[PDB]
Curated annotation (Swiss-Prot):
Species classification: Eukaryota, Metazoa, Chordata, Craniata, Vertebrata
Expression by tissue: Expressed in macrophages.
Locations listed in the record: Nucleus; Cytoplasm
Gene that this polypeptide is encoded by: PARP14
Protein name in UniProt: Protein mono-ADP-ribosyltransferase PARP14
Annotated transmembrane regions: none
Entry function: ADP-ribosyltransferase that mediates mono-ADP-ribosylation of glutamate residues on target proteins. In contrast to PARP1 and PARP2, it is not able to mediate poly-ADP-ribosylation. Has been shown to catalyze the mono-ADP-ribosylation of STAT1 at 'Glu-657' and 'Glu-705', thus decreasing STAT1 phosphorylation which negatively regulates pro-inflammatory cytokine production in macrophages in response to IFNG stimulation.
Induction of synthesis: Up-regulated by IFNG in macrophages. Down-regulated by IL4 in macrophages.
Protein family per UniProt: Belongs to the ARTD/PARP family.
PTM description: Auto-ADP-ribosylated.
Record text on subunit structure and interactions: Interacts with STAT6. Interacts with PARP10. Interacts with PARP9 in IFNG-stimulated macrophages; the interaction prevents PARP14-mediated STAT1 and STAT6 ADP-riboslylation.
Macro domain boundaries: 10-181
Naturally occurring in which organism (per UniProt): Homo sapiens (Human)
Binding site for a glycoprotein 3: 29-30, 41, 52, 126-130, 165
Amino acid sequence: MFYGTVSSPDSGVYEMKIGSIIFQVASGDITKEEADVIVNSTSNSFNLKAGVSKAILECAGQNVERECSQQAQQRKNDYIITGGGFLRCKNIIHVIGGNDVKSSVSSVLQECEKKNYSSICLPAIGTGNAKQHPDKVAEAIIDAIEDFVQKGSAQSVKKVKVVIFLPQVLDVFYANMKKREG
Ligand SMILES: Nc1nnc(-c2ccc(O)cc2)s1
Ligand SMILES: [Cl-]
Ligand SMILES: [Cl-]
């Protein structure tokens, strides 16, 4: 009762509608993207600097690193919201790669509605240091967006894009989109 048709609007980009939201996937370096929010997949200490967390903390800068450590030593956080530093975004949301991916994406969507944001870009959360299986991660990300739409929670959020470091993981996301398409 939600899914549109899978097509390719731009070279290496695949998209489909999920209710009112445009869902897109592509391979590349997430630190070159522009969006209201960029998501970082990190450790429970919010100081991982390996794979996607290395590229995001390096390009964001030491002021963002300081924000992460300052919030980390204040309370036990499921995720942390910082400034964008030198990334092309308004905020970074740092989620824990080992946590339930559906719950992490649900939290990102709810925080973006609170700020009246329209665009989100995320990595294949948990497929790096956390070593979660790509097929399970794709199913969880798309399930979170479906639930958000079903509950009537999508109002400001219009575009959710997954930018994926390995082309082989992109192929798993595209197969999941084709499974669901109307
Ligand atoms: N096995 C891997 N999963 N993630 C990787 C990654 C992601 C973003 C980067 O900027 C660099 C490496 S390698
Ligand atoms: Cl990860
Ligand atoms: Cl990725």
